[PDB]
């Protein structure tokens, strides 16, 4: 997080390079965010 | 009360006529339009870095469907078919029968996600918070058949998004 | 007083002699209504309102003050409505909509709900 | 002459051109005819509500409001004061959404692309107000016969204030690009002139009437909800051309901000749907504890409420013009007939007249100035 | 009284039949243009056979008002074809080139299903 | 619980499984059959019976307004346990 | 908001306006995404007495249309009084 | 000749002596609310939902049981009549369980539909509800007796039509219970008909349990062929399947009853 | 006043009743029934021959000035001999009022086109012909407006099936979009929602 | 009184050719004109007021993919409402359909006497209340 950035860019996720056996170094996808962080990353809450 | 948008008489003194002549010949008001786009070039763009950044949503967002459970693991749905009656698109198909233990449970629960208009009437109608629209909006498929959900898919979504579906319901049920 | 520069409405030109045009049109309307039978309700009502507007044209020479009496918008809109009234009177003589009802409807034509 | 087939909402123009001039314009519609009016006859009054979000899909909550006003009239019930203020609040936010689309896509069609991107960063912020109240960015289904679905979430009115505090500056940036631009003026001034009497006889409404000097606006002549408790001015054109209608829409955006500034200060407390469980569903916390509330929740969502037999024509001042529904009730839970009067249906029918003696490139300007969306024309 | 009905265009079958023949001539003259303009693979003989079949379907009508509507609809159908409002798909919908022949006899209908 | 028929295909909580000679099994070739491994009939049987000291008890599924409509369960019969019609929780009277 | 002072002047001059006071990008001045729970009010019909439904039943007060004339001297009238002429706005009569 | 003239909302109607207020209202097309009255059972007059005002009469009368006297004006829509119904509907729903979603009668319940039309729209009952024990009367009729509204339709049917005096009322006051007292199966060839006459979900069809909702079934009117009586039935289908069989009225053949084999 | 009941405007109900009699006296030859609803809407029911006279009177008369055709549509009621019902909604800007004019027709009887009175009726009548099959005489250009080219039938009639009789499809053999008889992988489920208990006694019909 | 020329047509009204219905669904269909039977689960009689016209049920099969209920009958859901029996037959005849008409079944009036429950010498006496 970086709260000096304008709303919408103040939270971001750097995806993992491997998930469930799939090489995600280049092939990142928005559906790789687990539900617990999916609520925080979309600003549905302020509590990580 | 009304106002006129384009009811004006331009002044006809030589000072004003020469101003309009200067504008016609020196392109003054066109260059003024170049200064408005030059300013934007030196502003911060509003673009976000998707998929690493995501657009803000609220707890009320209506996304992918899911069937929920009680904390014990029992299904919340008791096959009342209210969601099937209210569904404006007729996207819900339900069949039920007494379960081996005698409970009122569904044997078929399909949502045709290609008839559905993602309206939320099914979760309003449900009296036990069984059928909800979750926060996921990133479930596009490569085939039309993957979007005809049955009870197994919907129960898998619920067990997959309960951690986040429960939190959203906790943040909005007082408005309902 | 001073002639208006524009009527505000597009395509509705300014009339420089509103009083003269109105007395001509109201008098023409009353002449045409003379061909309608006396018992006709269109004649009795149309004359009643035509005379009131004519009686107000021959009572106030101020155009801005005549509009406040007629309550029909700008004086150019009153003239246009006078022309429309005249065009209707000529058309009503052909139609003769004071005769009895041409035909009553079927038994349940206007019953709702069915 | 030369007969051409322009087109691929999606429209088909069968034009007859004598060189550069247009001799007759023959719009062919129905490319987006979906049988909405026939489908509504198989739905309950609640089930038919999402259909109106999808007629004029740039002014979603104004379509919902017109239908709700019609059903509320046949029901003979009255929404509570807070719901009415919410409807006016989001009716004027919806007017901004539509006028941005109308002005900026109009400019985009005639080659001015930049303002579209500026003002769609404000639409993206107004779509967040839609999403925070209803959960859907566009097709909220938030306005319903009886009031609104849910109450405003806490803090939404502060964010509406922050947005409206800066929107005037965004309109000025738009005007700095178009209003005094000589290229923009040459494409709109003296284009598509409509006289006041032709405008009325051809069934026009909205800025089509007001661009030609006709002083008419249903928010002031036939007020609905609480529009009679808000102060605003109705812009009036003088030339009756595309440029005057462009100014009317831009000034109407400023008057919406003026109204929105009052709905935020005059918002009352209370409930947000009629306290009558035979029309509006009970609260969920009482549907789970009271027998009467459970029966009414069960019936309102399965059968729906019955509307007394009758027929009404209800109209509102939608962003695109007079939007109205002729709604017929037979006493059952489902409408017998629902004719939708779309303002763009009469405007488009007048394209042939408005395009007389104009170049082929002026037809694009004329269609843009009528603000046509073919969801409501075709239905 | 009861049988008094306002007409559309014709006052009796003789007047109605005149319009039918005029429409038939208009269609007959048009088929060659439709085949060439739409690049249809049918022949002019097939097209004119289809026009004849359409006219012969409504040869049992004895109500002038019903005939006037048939002619009014036919004129509209001709207009859509002459002005090329229709496309090659709309013209080829009179021939049903993709529907397998439905059985006509009792035994053939008995095997496939229950529809009579 | 989850069990497999004599062809390798899992059986759903509704008892659904394709017969050995059903052509509809071809849809799972190169793919998978989606089955929820959290059979609810089994999980609800793991909940201990609640021992309450009154003839009539109420259940709302837990959570107040986040549960299910409040029902009242009679406990007079001493041969069976009063079960909730919505959530399946069982209740018993304290030895009388 | 991260623009250097030189760039702020350049953008402000080119647009002829003070943009830094009205930015189109939202910052901390927005509402917190987690808010305290509400307690919404209840309508006028939440009463335990003097609240019979027959005294507030809107649907049951609607009546069938009144027939003013069915097929099965007097001053003329109009549908309503003529609309009163609008006044110019004193906020801004001319744009 | 011997008819007498009465008034329903002021409209004159000629009725025979002994005609009830409820039957006089039928002739003018008005159906008085009801839970305990059935035109093929004896009159009981216990649910009190049929209370109607008679002009000049201080006290509301039970339409189902009160014979209509000459010159009476029946006010089926006055405030006193409307308040009488809301009061009875309020009592009738006080102890009733919130079982509509899990109740097989939902969507075709005479307690739901007369709460929507003649009752109030909200509750003011702040106490705890009453729950009752479930009887087991056979493999056809499922009994969830917390839903019973003590209307005694099943008692009068089992006694007067099926000729089986096995159902009755045990207890007294708010604890009055309908049942067999002892553990007894109600197995008569007409037993399944208590499912229909019961206006609530207390008596439902065990074979049909949980399988459908009434609004989604398509109704096909047919003839029973299980015997030679030729009873008229309604075949309820849904999505190409036969869901249940209901009786269809025919005064000259079967009235509104069918045998258990037909059902 | 009850917070949940729509308030009644008795002043406007009296004005609209008075003007209804006004129209019923000036045009006796056509007006068949005049009525005013509880929400203050005025309906003038006319014989179909009186379309041009009545509409012209309402447009041109000085006490009418109904210069805007808000809408023009039809209703299909199969139980009537004249199943179709043509409804004209007119708006007066002078008197800030609205009036509704209703007539009737059947499948074979034409109705005189009102394009001469209101030029807005051009497309509104092409839609009535396209969706209901009513024919309008002397219409400058009458033809389908909403339905597909060559589409057979009139969809908005009450006896026309909701899903129609044909559906489109692309066929690779003939390399074009074809039309075939409609088959549905899931049939539109029909719900019988009407309650068997009367809801509105005020609208009860005599037996 | 109508100042418009009329004509005389002596033939029965028949619109089968100007409705767009495929011939399969005119000749082979059997309309059923009836007053719906009261739903026996309820005592209300407000659904037994109007005449209805339904058509003959045809095949519904199972969608191979989902098991849904497919149909090839475009008239499967068509139900028309009519105020009287004659209005219903008039509408079926002019559309060329073949119909069966079932006469209305009104429940005959009955003699209800609450005093018969306490008869001195008759079997109408009830053993319980
Ligand atoms: C033409 C002249 C261009 C001058 C270069 C830009 C500069 O040095 O001042 C930018 C500086 C910062 O930009 P800003 O609009 O004020 O707001 C952004 C924040 O201040 C600062 O934003 P920030 O905090 O996010 O800064 C982080 C940024 C670091 O920001 C910078 O380093 C500025 C870019 C310089 C490179 O990190 C990076 O992204 C660096 C990688 C990107 C480099 C891409 C440009 C490379 C030069 C072109 C290739 C040549 C080979 O603006 C100026 O002061 C311009 C002054 C006039 C420049 C002419 C005199 C030299
Ligand atoms: C004593 C010494 C005497 C010596 C001679 C003195 C000369 C005095 C000055 C001469 C007059 C000045 C002539 C200027 C050119 C005239 C232009 C003109 O015709 O305007 C009228 C035209 C027409 O104007 P109009 O549309 O209003 O119509 C005018 C005529 N009526 C109204 C009758 C139809 O305007 C335009 O040229 C349109 C401009 C479109 C271009 C848009 C892009 C502009 C972006 C700015 C680019 C800047 C370019 C810089 C390039 C630098 C390259 C190194
Ligand atoms: C890094 C980038 C550094 C800056 C690069 C230069 C940017 C220049 C474009 C932005 C200009 C700022 C906007 C502005 O001040 O315009 C308002 C002003 C005023 O615009 P105005 O038209 O609104 O003024 C109206 C009032 N009267 C009529 C009295 C003037 O624009 C000008 O004054 C421009 C006049 C000079 C243009 C001469 C023609 C071009 C000839 C080119 C050479 C050949
Ligand atoms: C030198 C220009 C300034 C000037 O003319 O003096 C000011 C004077 C006052 O202006 P004004 O309001 O018109 O006064 C008279 C009103 N009856 O102006 C006047 O009164 C003069 C009245 C107008 C007559 C002179 C205008 C001549 C314009 C010809 C074009 C000149 C430019 C040609 C070259 C252009 C090259 C780019
Ligand atoms: C290379 C092109 C030149 C621009 C880069 C050099 C600018 C150096 C600088 O300090 O900015 C100039 C000035 C802002 O300077 P600053 O240090 O931020 O202090 C401002 C206090 N009034 O900028 C200003 O705001 C003043 C006006 C700048 C020149 C016009
Ligand atoms: S969101 Fe709406 S359309 Fe989708 S399943 Fe739920 S009720 Fe049906
Ligand atoms: S999801 Fe909810 S509304 Fe739908 S059948 Fe299950 S319990 Fe009823
Ligand atoms: S009997 Fe009727 S009111 Fe009672 S739970 Fe069942 S459906 Fe609901
Ligand atoms: S079980 Fe049913 S029929 Fe018997 S008394 Fe109770 S409610 Fe009446
Ligand atoms: S119906 Fe009369 S008291 Fe029960
Ligand atoms: K029952
Ligand atoms: Zn529970």
XYZ file of N, CA and C and ligand atoms in Angstrom, chain H residues 35-36 145 147-156 167 169 178 194 197-203, ligand 9:
80
model
N -62.275 -19.927 7.154
C -61.318 -20.997 7.399
C -61.987 -22.296 7.810
N -63.047 -22.231 8.612
C -63.681 -23.428 9.147
C -64.894 -23.872 8.351
N -48.258 -30.399 13.054
C -49.445 -29.859 13.698
C -49.212 -28.528 14.395
N -48.765 -26.048 12.700
C -49.431 -25.196 11.727
C -50.947 -25.259 11.815
N -51.497 -26.185 12.591
C -52.942 -26.327 12.669
C -53.570 -25.084 13.284
N -54.679 -24.645 12.700
C -55.416 -23.489 13.182
C -56.748 -23.904 13.807
N -56.854 -25.157 14.248
C -57.995 -25.646 15.020
C -59.321 -25.319 14.340
N -59.413 -25.647 13.056
C -60.624 -25.363 12.299
C -61.605 -26.526 12.291
N -61.141 -27.738 12.586
C -61.969 -28.931 12.716
C -62.551 -29.408 11.391
N -61.986 -28.991 10.258
C -62.428 -29.538 8.980
C -62.145 -31.030 8.904
N -60.944 -31.437 9.312
C -60.585 -32.847 9.260
C -61.483 -33.671 10.170
N -61.853 -33.118 11.323
C -62.725 -33.833 12.250
C -64.084 -34.087 11.613
N -64.660 -33.062 10.989
C -65.992 -33.207 10.414
C -65.966 -34.065 9.157
N -60.590 -38.948 14.522
C -59.996 -37.644 14.768
C -60.889 -36.841 15.700
N -60.578 -33.538 19.141
C -59.819 -32.513 19.842
C -59.487 -33.007 21.239
N -55.625 -31.239 17.834
C -56.339 -32.139 16.939
C -55.463 -33.355 16.694
N -58.371 -35.295 3.475
C -58.132 -34.317 4.526
C -56.952 -33.422 4.182
N -58.915 -30.423 2.253
C -59.793 -29.567 3.042
C -59.007 -28.799 4.093
N -57.906 -29.349 4.580
C -57.098 -28.627 5.548
C -56.566 -27.358 4.894
N -56.909 -26.169 5.396
C -56.518 -24.943 4.694
C -55.065 -24.564 4.887
N -54.338 -25.270 5.745
C -52.980 -24.928 6.113
C -52.097 -26.149 5.886
N -50.814 -25.993 6.187
C -49.836 -27.023 5.912
C -49.720 -28.040 7.023
N -50.715 -28.077 7.906
C -50.725 -29.091 8.952
C -50.841 -30.487 8.360
N -51.730 -30.667 7.393
C -51.919 -31.940 6.709
C -51.486 -31.768 5.261
S -55.424 -30.235 10.912
Fe -56.095 -28.785 9.265
S -58.273 -29.359 8.860
Fe -57.713 -30.309 10.869
S -58.367 -28.760 12.432
Fe -56.163 -28.336 11.973
S -56.226 -26.750 10.317
Fe -58.319 -27.673 10.413
